[PDB]
Amino acid sequence: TTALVCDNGSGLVKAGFAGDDAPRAVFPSIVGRPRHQGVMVGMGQKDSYVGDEAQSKRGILTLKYPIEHGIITNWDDMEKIWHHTFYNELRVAPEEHPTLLTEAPLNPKANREKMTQIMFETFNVPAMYVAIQAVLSLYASGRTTGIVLDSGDGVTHNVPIYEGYALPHAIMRLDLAGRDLTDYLMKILTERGYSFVTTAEREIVRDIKEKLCYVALDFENEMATAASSSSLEKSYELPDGQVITIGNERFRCPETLFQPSFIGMESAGIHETTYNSIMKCDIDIRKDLYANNVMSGGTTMYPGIADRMQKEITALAPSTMKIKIIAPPERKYSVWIGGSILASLSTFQQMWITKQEYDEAGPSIVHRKCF
Amino acid sequence: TTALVCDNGSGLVKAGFAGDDAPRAVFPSIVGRPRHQGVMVGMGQKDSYVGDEAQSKRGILTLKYPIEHGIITNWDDMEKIWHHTFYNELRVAPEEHPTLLTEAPLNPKANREKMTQIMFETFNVPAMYVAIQAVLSLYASGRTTGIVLDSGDGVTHNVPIYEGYALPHAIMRLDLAGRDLTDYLMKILTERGYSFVTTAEREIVRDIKEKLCYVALDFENEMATAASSSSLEKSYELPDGQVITIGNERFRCPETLFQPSFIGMESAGIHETTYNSIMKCDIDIRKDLYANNVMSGGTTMYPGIADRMQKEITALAPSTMKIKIIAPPERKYSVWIGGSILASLSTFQQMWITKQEYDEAGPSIVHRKCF
Amino acid sequence: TTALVCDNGSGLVKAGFAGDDAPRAVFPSIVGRPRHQGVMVGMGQKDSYVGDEAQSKRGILTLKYPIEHGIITNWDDMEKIWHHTFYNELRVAPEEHPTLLTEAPLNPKANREKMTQIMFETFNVPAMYVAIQAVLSLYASGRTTGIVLDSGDGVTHNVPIYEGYALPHAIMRLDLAGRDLTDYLMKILTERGYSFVTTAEREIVRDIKEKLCYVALDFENEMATAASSSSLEKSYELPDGQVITIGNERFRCPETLFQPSFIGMESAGIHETTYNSIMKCDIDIRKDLYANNVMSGGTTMYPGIADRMQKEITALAPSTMKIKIIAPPERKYSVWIGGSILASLSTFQQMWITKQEYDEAGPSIVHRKCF
Ligand SMILES: Nc1ncnc2c1ncn2[C@@H]1O[C@H](COP(=O)(O)OP(=O)(O)O)[C@@H](O)[C@H]1O
Ligand SMILES: Nc1ncnc2c1ncn2[C@@H]1O[C@H](COP(=O)(O)OP(=O)(O)O)[C@@H](O)[C@H]1O
Ligand SMILES: Nc1ncnc2c1ncn2[C@@H]1O[C@H](COP(=O)(O)OP(=O)(O)O)[C@@H](O)[C@H]1O
Ligand SMILES: [Mg+2]
Ligand SMILES: [Mg+2]
Ligand SMILES: [Mg+2]
């Protein structure tokens, strides 16, 4: 039958059936519990809400994110998220569908051990498999050679591949993601007097970040222009009728990706990370990786990130190379699209982990089979 | 000439001269205007009163604070308060003495912009400077490495410093301080039949709070003791001659610091704020910050506050670490003492913002010369 | 006059006087600068910190190493380090003492050219000499025959010397050293949850490696045993009282020496490289090199490394030969010890490059005199 492809992101959940062109159900990965006191009978029920029905009620809920930087911290909540996706979104009983999850590179082993343990023990899936996200992103584009940048809500990592032969000694992982951008935005917005303090208001700040932010091609010059003129201002309207206006915050926020010292981090931005990853491979294949620089992840949707990366990576490499950022319009869902492509290959059906093997080897087999 | 220090707090204006060890003047920051029609000739002058001459007469006045959570909400009254200070209380022509002011972190820029503009244009002080309250509080103790929990009247913030290099990425600020506790105290006194509603009677409940309230080392145990005994109850007499009595209110009111969910807020109490601030820092410097939990501000005078914070953080942090709380006896004027020390340093005389610089750059200078 | 000796290694500086027993000062070579912004007047000085003091304050600094793979990559900082070693650790006037140095084999000539230039012109030392490290190592053992293995922090090299005649073609230089092992340990410590990314955390991962890691005597059996139980597990406490546990990460890191493919390289482990070095020398002298096998360098201090090397070499060479690994307990400082021995020999005082000869011939004379 058709196997599920559930891409549990750090902030979003994508689910669907192998082969399709787009995820069937997409909903945020949060769980909210009421905090005030219910003074009425038979109303205000359901001690816990998940996804959209926790977004719409968020005003009176305290919203938790089960995953934290690509690591599942609250397993009791993650079981709930998976239950939601399997039953209330997809409307399937997973006991007849194989599954194909995803993980970030360099993620702690116990994370995926417990992942597969739950999948086999609670949901009784006949077989399943766990694939790194960079490999799926590289499938989606339909090629074999390139270096993936996959920047999501929890983790930003890079993975270079040459003709199907991975180079695990060049994979670099940098935990500066969309969540940290939103949490820095909440802090900088006070400079104007708009105090967002609650977990609910954090979703409002995420919405402002998605709607209005954009990466400056040249940070210093846009600083000067924005300070010297009001042509860069823009206004947002809160759910309660208020109106908030923001000026240079719009590009001050995404710039954290390229200058992690804005939030105290010591690393070098994503551009330097990619350059270092490419300069760690063999000398012959650096030329090809310079030319097939793939992008992915929702966080790479900031208008102008492709051009800023092009600039900041052409400034580094030798002047005789062709540095070519690939930025598909659907790069938000490239991981899932790659997963769906993968699961439908006939020659991949011998890479599943069958329930029979799990019943005979324990969860540790996930390492002896998967990547 | 000698530099003045004017720590125009939210509850009490502390104004004095650099080089001294105590403020030359303390008075409430309230401006009241009468409300009952006058009927006598030879009277009825001076429609507005400030400070103590408004506190005494409040029987016939409506009192209003100009600062609201460390943000000035009505400048027309703040000019009046500064004028009162300089001319009637300190009695110095301000245009012959530099002045040093204090501002809480994450405070909107416009606040300090107008703060500088008023001083330079109206009072024409030859020079001035604005400093964050936590750094002055650190100066007051003679240290150079600690984490300062300043709980003023409006705002409670937390600024970890290590060897003089502050760590802005890990600062906190919780809008929960004196006035909120006074409001909660008024709200829970109603349970006994004491209905205070007016702006005058809030200045009776504030005194009740300052006299009878304390902090419980174990809130549940105190609740049980109150339920099963009358030992905790205490007696207080109103201005007109009535006597009131309050029981568990005494330790309920300050408990709102550690469980903000009492007054509805999502945020976490002061102990969790401090632990989060310490953790965010570099792993090698948490050791020293654990042992320098300085305290300041008026609201940090409740009995049992230092001991309670000691217990809480010692319960949160790793068991091996030595947690210490530093609560100097005069910690109510810690910020003013810090400013007094700072204004005297010879190395500091170069950091004044001069009137010429203000003319050269205007209000935007305060974002370069001052922290 | 007395001659100084300074083994400018990659990871640590071993300085001191000729003729002594042990180095006078052994301080890490790192020039750090503060990354945060100071706020407190009255302290926060000394824009850069070098060596020990840099290690002490590394909580708020970025630590860069001036030497990388035994080639001075940053002269601005190496000059500061030399100035420190002379004027604050040895506390001597360098202009009065002949100064010996060291350099790895097959090291670019511009390196030592500028080394001699700086020593003769900036410090105005009277005479100097750049002796290859392995030869000094072999002096320190008293021998005059054998095959030196010296695994510094940056570079690993073999130098077969027979009867005082160094055979230059059989030399081998392998850029696998301590820092590579540190980085690989940092990489494989993510398998349990940890994240050491800052340059400050490199100086803690190196210490975990120095304290716990050990070489296996048979890697496959070690892995099989480790998988069986938790007997091998050991626990180490970070600077802030948090405890971490590691199992097979203790001996997967040192195994990089004997299977360089772990960190992505192609070349064969140190044992195959030594066997290949011997098997390029004349047949008449392979017996003498087999039975004399000197060790050196800090990285050769893993418990059991000598035994593993002996096993692996005997596994290749003909059965008749008697292999012997010489591992003096003081081998970490062998290079400096040999330098001090050499600087004292009466026959040596003619090898000096005098200031007059430097003036006559320029920097290039160090190629014609120094081996
Ligand atoms: N159009 C957009 N522009 C900018 N940021 C966006 C946009 N859409 C989503 N984001 C941000 O990217 C993150 C979600 O992207 P996503 O790829 O799904 O993360 P994850 O790996 O967990 O699945 C969120 O932090 C969100 O704020
Ligand atoms: N001994 C005390 N106990 C409890 N609350 C106090 C005490 N002294 C002052 N307060 C309260 O703290 C506030 C004033 O203290 P203060 O430190 O000066 O605040 P601010 O930051 O505005 O300067 C007032 O609300 C006052 O009621
Ligand atoms: N007992 C030990 N075990 C393992 N590694 C060690 C030990 N002592 C030092 N090292 C490593 O050796 C390196 C420094 O040794 P060293 O020989 O002096 O290098 P260099 O020649 O540049 O001076 C460091 O990276 C350190 O991690
Ligand atoms: Mg993702
Ligand atoms: Mg205050
Ligand atoms: Mg060496």
Side-chain angles (χ1 to χ4, degrees):
Chain A
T1 193
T2 63
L4 303 179
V5 182
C6 195
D7 172 46
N8 279 102
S10 304
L12 268 160
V13 169
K14 283 77 69 180
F17 294 82
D20 287 5
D21 61 355
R24 196 72 65 82
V26 189
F27 64 97
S29 179
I30 60 183
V31 178
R33 295 171 173 80
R35 60 184 185 177
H36 294 312
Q37 74 182 30
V39 295
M40 293 177 70
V41 299
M43 172 85 228
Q45 55 269 7
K46 208 190 178 184
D47 189 359
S48 56
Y49 310 84
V50 185
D52 291 301
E53 51 176 30
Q55 269 291 352
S56 61
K57 293 180 185 284
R58 71 185 181 220
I60 45 160
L61 316 179
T62 64
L63 302 176
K64 290 291 191 80
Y65 281 81
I67 295 170
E68 185 67 30
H69 301 306
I71 297 156
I72 301 160
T73 71
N74 192 320
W75 281 91
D76 193 339
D77 273 28
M78 197 54 173
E79 156 181 294
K80 218 176 187 74
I81 300 306
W82 274 322
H83 178 91
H84 190 70
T85 292
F86 286 154
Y87 303 110
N88 300 9
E89 284 313 89
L90 302 179
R91 306 290 155 59
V92 298
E95 291 81 2
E96 61 275 20
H97 293 276
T99 298
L100 171 63
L101 297 175
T102 67
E103 202 188 30
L106 297 176
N107 207 7
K109 290 175 62 174
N111 193 73
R112 47 163 50 187
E113 285 164 20
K114 288 185 189 295
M115 184 179 291
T116 188
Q117 173 172 291
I118 289 295
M119 292 324 268
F120 270 120
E121 188 209 337
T122 292
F123 301 112
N124 301 339
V125 301
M128 74 89 58
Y129 188 68
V130 188
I132 300 302
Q133 287 169 353
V135 185
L136 312 192
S137 281
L138 192 73
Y139 281 114
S141 190
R143 66 189 72 219
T144 73
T145 295
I147 181 169
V148 176
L149 160 56
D150 193 288
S151 180
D153 189 4
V155 184
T156 296
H157 69 251
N158 293 316
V159 172
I161 288 161
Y162 184 61
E163 183 178 1
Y165 284 89
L167 323 170
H169 68 91
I171 291 179
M172 275 158 89
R173 183 178 150 174
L174 187 152
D175 289 337
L176 184 45
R179 204 92 81 71
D180 287 286
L181 303 182
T182 304
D183 295 348
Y184 174 59
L185 185 64
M186 272 170 101
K187 188 180 77 78
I188 70 170
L189 273 174
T190 71
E191 293 178 4
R192 312 180 81 77
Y194 318 125
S195 183
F196 296 114
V197 294
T198 315
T199 55
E201 279 174 338
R202 184 177 179 179
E203 303 293 307
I204 299 173
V205 176
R206 177 184 63 69
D207 213 345
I208 295 160
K209 182 199 72 186
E210 291 175 36
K211 185 67 67 67
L212 307 187
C213 291
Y214 79 93
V215 169
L217 177 58
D218 186 356
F219 187 77
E220 286 282 282
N221 295 321
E222 286 199 4
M223 271 275 168
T225 300
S228 62
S229 74
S230 299
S231 67
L232 289 167
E233 289 207 324
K234 182 166 301 320
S235 305
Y236 179 97
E237 183 180 334
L238 310 187
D240 77 354
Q242 281 181 69
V243 66
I244 74 171
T245 71
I246 66 173
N248 54 62
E249 285 79 345
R250 295 171 62 213
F251 65 84
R252 273 176 60 196
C253 179
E255 182 65 26
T256 311
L257 292 169
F258 292 81
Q259 302 177 45
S261 58
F262 276 13
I263 67 185
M265 270 191 98
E266 205 201 14
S267 65
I270 53 173
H271 58 296
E272 278 187 61
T273 306
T274 306
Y275 181 74
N276 297 359
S277 171
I278 299 158
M279 300 285 307
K280 278 198 175 297
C281 307
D282 303 81
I283 187 158
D284 303 74
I285 57 179
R286 294 176 194 173
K287 166 175 163 280
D288 298 280
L289 302 181
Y290 275 126
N292 290 276
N293 205 310
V294 179
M295 296 192 80
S296 182
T299 297
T300 61
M301 277 265 166
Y302 295 122
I305 197 168
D307 179 50
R308 179 69 179 290
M309 270 275 268
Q310 172 95 63
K311 177 179 178 283
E312 298 279 23
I313 193 183
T314 306
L316 288 175
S319 63
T320 176
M321 301 285 178
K322 325 273 191 63
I323 322 303
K324 176 179 176 179
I325 308 302
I326 287 176
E330 70 189 6
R331 62 182 179 272
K332 186 162 179 168
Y333 288 159
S334 288
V335 172
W336 190 89
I337 292 160
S340 181
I341 283 168
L342 182 63
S344 304
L345 293 176
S346 183
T347 49
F348 171 86
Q349 304 309 300
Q350 305 316 69
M351 311 326 268
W352 287 124
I353 298 144
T354 65
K355 179 75 164 64
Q356 173 264 311
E357 280 159 292
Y358 176 90
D359 293 358
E360 190 276 331
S364 62
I365 195 172
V366 67
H367 305 303
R368 185 252 299 290
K369 292 216 86 173
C370 305
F371 180 38
Chain B
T1 197
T2 68
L4 316 179
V5 177
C6 181
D7 171 38
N8 52 3
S10 296
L12 276 294
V13 178
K14 280 82 73 180
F17 294 74
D20 298 358
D21 200 275
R24 195 146 176 290
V26 179
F27 64 95
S29 191
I30 68 186
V31 188
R33 295 180 173 77
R35 57 194 189 94
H36 290 306
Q37 63 185 6
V39 304
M40 277 201 167
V41 183
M43 301 305 188
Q45 72 287 344
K46 189 168 179 180
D47 67 348
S48 52
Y49 306 95
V50 183
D52 288 323
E53 47 166 349
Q55 271 285 354
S56 53
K57 285 195 174 191
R58 73 191 180 239
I60 57 158
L61 312 171
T62 298
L63 308 172
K64 298 293 183 68
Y65 289 81
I67 305 195
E68 198 79 33
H69 308 298
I71 309 155
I72 295 156
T73 192
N74 189 317
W75 288 91
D76 188 8
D77 288 345
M78 198 87 265
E79 320 207 359
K80 185 188 305 316
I81 290 188
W82 279 319
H83 170 278
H84 177 78
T85 302
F86 287 143
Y87 294 111
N88 296 15
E89 198 68 17
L90 261 52
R91 314 171 161 300
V92 69
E95 61 198 304
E96 312 279 359
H97 300 266
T99 291
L100 171 69
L101 301 168
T102 70
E103 192 190 37
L106 314 193
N107 188 358
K109 285 164 60 177
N111 198 80
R112 52 160 52 196
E113 278 181 353
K114 271 279 275 165
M115 201 148 76
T116 300
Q117 180 183 327
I118 289 293
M119 294 277 197
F120 268 128
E121 298 188 356
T122 66
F123 299 101
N124 199 46
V125 303
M128 62 95 88
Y129 187 103
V130 176
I132 294 297
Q133 292 176 357
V135 188
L136 304 187
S137 297
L138 198 53
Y139 268 98
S141 194
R143 285 176 165 69
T144 56
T145 294
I147 190 166
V148 192
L149 162 56
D150 186 286
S151 192
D153 189 340
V155 63
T156 291
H157 61 265
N158 200 285
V159 185
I161 278 174
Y162 176 87
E163 289 167 48
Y165 296 77
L167 293 98
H169 68 87
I171 288 175
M172 322 284 306
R173 182 186 137 155
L174 262 64
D175 292 331
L176 168 58
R179 287 173 194 169
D180 300 331
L181 304 177
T182 300
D183 300 338
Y184 191 55
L185 173 60
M186 281 206 308
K187 201 176 81 72
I188 63 177
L189 275 176
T190 63
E191 295 166 4
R192 302 197 174 253
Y194 311 113
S195 292
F196 306 117
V197 289
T198 49
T199 53
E201 296 164 359
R202 271 179 73 263
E203 311 311 335
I204 285 166
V205 176
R206 182 177 61 79
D207 182 61
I208 288 160
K209 183 193 80 192
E210 288 183 18
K211 301 290 138 60
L212 301 189
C213 288
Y214 69 95
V215 177
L217 183 57
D218 183 352
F219 181 50
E220 294 294 328
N221 297 347
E222 311 322 325
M223 211 75 177
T225 310
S228 61
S229 75
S230 61
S231 66
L232 294 174
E233 293 180 353
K234 205 152 172 70
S235 306
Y236 182 88
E237 212 187 29
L238 297 198
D240 78 345
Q242 301 195 9
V243 63
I244 73 167
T245 299
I246 72 175
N248 52 73
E249 278 85 336
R250 295 176 62 209
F251 65 88
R252 271 164 68 190
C253 173
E255 169 58 19
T256 310
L257 289 161
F258 294 78
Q259 263 174 90
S261 55
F262 277 13
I263 48 171
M265 296 166 34
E266 184 71 24
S267 43
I270 67 175
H271 62 296
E272 269 195 62
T273 286
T274 292
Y275 185 45
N276 295 340
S277 178
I278 297 163
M279 281 265 268
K280 280 186 163 291
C281 294
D282 302 77
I283 190 159
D284 202 338
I285 73 167
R286 302 182 191 153
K287 178 171 176 280
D288 300 294
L289 304 192
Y290 276 123
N292 280 275
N293 296 295
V294 189
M295 310 204 98
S296 168
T299 291
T300 63
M301 301 284 296
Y302 292 119
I305 188 151
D307 292 331
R308 179 66 178 290
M309 272 205 68
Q310 203 84 60
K311 174 172 101 63
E312 299 282 25
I313 305 176
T314 61
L316 291 173
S319 62
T320 185
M321 291 307 223
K322 202 212 81 184
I323 308 304
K324 172 177 181 177
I325 300 295
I326 305 149
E330 78 273 350
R331 63 178 177 273
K332 197 161 174 183
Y333 309 164
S334 278
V335 182
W336 189 96
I337 301 299
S340 181
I341 301 299
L342 176 50
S344 303
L345 295 187
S346 181
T347 50
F348 185 87
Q349 304 300 47
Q350 188 274 331
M351 293 180 183
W352 291 119
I353 295 163
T354 77
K355 179 59 166 63
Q356 172 264 350
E357 289 159 329
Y358 175 56
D359 292 342
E360 181 76 340
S364 79
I365 194 65
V366 69
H367 313 307
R368 268 151 285 181
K369 292 215 79 174
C370 288
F371 176 33
Chain C
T1 185
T2 306
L4 314 186
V5 180
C6 189
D7 172 32
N8 291 110
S10 300
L12 282 72
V13 173
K14 278 87 77 176
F17 291 86
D20 279 358
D21 50 350
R24 186 83 90 83
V26 185
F27 65 94
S29 168
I30 58 190
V31 183
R33 298 183 177 77
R35 71 207 202 95
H36 295 309
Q37 59 88 26
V39 303
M40 292 191 75
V41 180
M43 61 145 268
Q45 62 277 354
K46 194 162 41 163
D47 276 308
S48 65
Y49 313 96
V50 181
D52 305 325
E53 54 192 1
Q55 269 281 98
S56 313
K57 304 199 179 203
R58 71 188 184 216
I60 56 163
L61 310 180
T62 58
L63 304 173
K64 311 302 197 80
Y65 285 87
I67 289 183
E68 292 263 1
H69 297 308
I71 78 178
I72 297 169
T73 290
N74 177 357
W75 292 100
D76 292 330
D77 300 331
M78 189 77 236
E79 171 173 11
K80 258 174 284 202
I81 287 184
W82 273 323
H83 172 275
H84 182 83
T85 309
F86 294 163
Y87 290 116
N88 305 336
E89 262 294 3
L90 296 177
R91 198 151 309 167
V92 59
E95 62 193 2
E96 305 188 327
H97 303 287
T99 302
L100 189 69
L101 294 167
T102 63
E103 193 180 48
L106 305 177
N107 193 0
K109 290 169 67 177
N111 180 83
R112 72 143 62 100
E113 274 197 14
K114 200 170 292 294
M115 212 164 58
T116 300
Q117 169 164 15
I118 182 163
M119 301 276 258
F120 271 121
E121 307 218 359
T122 302
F123 304 104
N124 294 2
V125 287
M128 41 75 68
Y129 184 71
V130 189
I132 299 302
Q133 287 176 347
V135 180
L136 302 181
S137 174
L138 200 154
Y139 290 167
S141 185
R143 285 180 165 72
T144 56
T145 297
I147 183 157
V148 170
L149 176 63
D150 188 276
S151 178
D153 184 355
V155 185
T156 298
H157 56 276
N158 294 74
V159 183
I161 307 191
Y162 175 83
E163 302 292 297
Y165 290 92
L167 291 93
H169 50 90
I171 299 180
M172 311 206 157
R173 171 171 164 158
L174 179 63
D175 294 359
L176 187 151
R179 204 170 301 175
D180 291 331
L181 303 174
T182 300
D183 290 340
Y184 184 45
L185 179 68
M186 188 174 324
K187 196 176 82 75
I188 65 187
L189 271 175
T190 61
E191 292 192 15
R192 297 198 186 246
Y194 320 122
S195 166
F196 301 117
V197 55
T198 313
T199 59
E201 321 288 1
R202 183 156 279 97
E203 298 281 310
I204 290 167
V205 180
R206 181 191 44 62
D207 179 35
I208 299 155
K209 187 198 78 194
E210 281 183 16
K211 186 64 68 64
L212 305 188
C213 290
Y214 69 86
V215 169
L217 183 63
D218 182 7
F219 185 84
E220 272 315 280
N221 300 307
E222 278 292 88
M223 293 297 289
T225 296
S228 72
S229 62
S230 61
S231 54
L232 294 174
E233 274 67 355
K234 211 158 176 71
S235 307
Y236 176 85
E237 193 174 296
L238 313 187
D240 80 342
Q242 283 153 354
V243 178
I244 73 167
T245 295
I246 62 170
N248 57 25
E249 290 91 348
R250 296 178 66 204
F251 65 89
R252 269 166 60 193
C253 175
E255 191 72 8
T256 303
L257 293 155
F258 303 93
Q259 304 187 49
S261 63
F262 280 20
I263 62 166
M265 293 182 286
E266 180 144 6
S267 57
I270 54 167
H271 61 299
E272 301 266 30
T273 297
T274 295
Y275 175 73
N276 298 356
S277 171
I278 293 163
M279 283 287 289
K280 285 195 197 297
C281 285
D282 303 0
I283 197 170
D284 309 324
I285 63 175
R286 293 175 200 161
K287 194 182 281 313
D288 313 298
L289 305 187
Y290 277 123
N292 311 336
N293 212 312
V294 178
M295 282 275 208
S296 176
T299 293
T300 59
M301 295 282 284
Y302 296 100
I305 189 177
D307 306 321
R308 180 66 175 288
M309 265 275 285
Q310 203 173 358
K311 166 179 178 284
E312 274 298 357
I313 293 178
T314 307
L316 297 166
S319 54
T320 183
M321 294 296 172
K322 279 71 68 178
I323 314 307
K324 186 178 185 297
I325 304 281
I326 299 143
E330 83 290 2
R331 62 186 165 276
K332 185 182 169 189
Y333 309 90
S334 296
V335 188
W336 183 97
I337 295 160
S340 69
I341 281 165
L342 173 53
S344 305
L345 298 190
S346 185
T347 51
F348 177 76
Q349 313 314 90
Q350 68 195 326
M351 294 296 172
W352 289 123
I353 298 162
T354 77
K355 179 63 166 63
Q356 190 59 256
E357 295 199 348
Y358 164 80
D359 295 347
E360 288 174 28
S364 62
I365 183 165
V366 67
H367 308 308
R368 306 202 287 99
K369 294 207 80 172
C370 281
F371 164 54

